[PDB]
């Protein structure tokens, strides 16, 4: 029913989560710049890069994280970098269908050189987590939980990470039981969509070994953090 030191965690994270929006600069491009693969691929990558920075600023702010082995943080963010991106992509697609952008976002991904075989599942998935109808609060933690997923590959100390995860898992534990009492499977069905997401890692990384436009190349940060080629 949410102790006061939990409502402190929760409050912060929503400050943590929203503080970093992304530039209106690279956004007047979505809803205006013209429409070729040449163009679109460039927009998306540039966004992807942009959001790794939003994702690290947040990760940075998360409780305790800062203490963890320096050579672990890197290991935790080279993990979630993708998966957390899929969580974002959901927040803007199945949720939040405004009148500004978002559908013109899907528009450009359609013509981005990204292969349909790869897309039509990833979107039929955005439908699936749509059907949950999630909270901004709900995505907020998820993303944190994923940044902090105890056993990413090549971790020094898991307990140190588990440690940091647990207070977040136990909020969203209660948060579900409170804000959705009707079916308690939910919380596990959330955690399940996380597992359902680590399967999207391979599929993504394979897609990179194919995405290519008019002799364009991926931003250097992107390449680093998606281990491209």
């Amino acid at each position: 029913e949410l102790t006061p030191d939990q409502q402190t965690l929760l409050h912060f994270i929503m400050d943590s989560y929203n503080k970093q929006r992304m530039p209106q600069e690279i956004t007047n491009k979505i809803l205006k710049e013209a429409f070729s693969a040449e163009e679109n691929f460039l927009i998306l990558t540039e966004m992807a890069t942009n959001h790794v920075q939003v994702l690290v600023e947040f990760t940075k702010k998360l409780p305790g994280f800062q203490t963890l082995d320096h050579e672990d943080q890197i290991a935790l963010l080279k993990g979630s970098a993708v998966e957390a991106m899929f969580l974002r992509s959901a927040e803007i697609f199945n949720k939040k269908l405004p009148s500004g952008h978002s559908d013109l976002l899907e528009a450009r991904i359609r013509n981005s050189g990204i292969s349909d075989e790869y897309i039509t599942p990833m979107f039929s998935f955005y439908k699936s987590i749509g059907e949950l109808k999630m909270t901004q609060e709900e995505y907020a933690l998820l993303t944190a939980i994923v940044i902090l997923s105890p056993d990413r590959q090549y971790i020094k100390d898991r307990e140190a990470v588990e440690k940091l995860q647990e207070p977040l898992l136990d909020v969203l534990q209660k948060l579900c039981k409170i804000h959705q009492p009707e079916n308690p499977q939910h919380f596990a069905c959330l955690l399940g969509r996380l597992t359902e997401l680590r399967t999207f890692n391979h599929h993504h990384a394979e897609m990179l070994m194919s995405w290519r436009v008019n002799d364009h190349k991926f931003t250097p940060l992107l390449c680093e953090i998606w281990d491209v080629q």
Binding site: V52, H70, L221, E224, I225
Partner: peptide, 13 residues
Amino acid sequence: KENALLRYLLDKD
């Protein structure tokens, strides 16, 4: 190797 772009990215204040 040392993915430094990310090292820097978080190492920065």
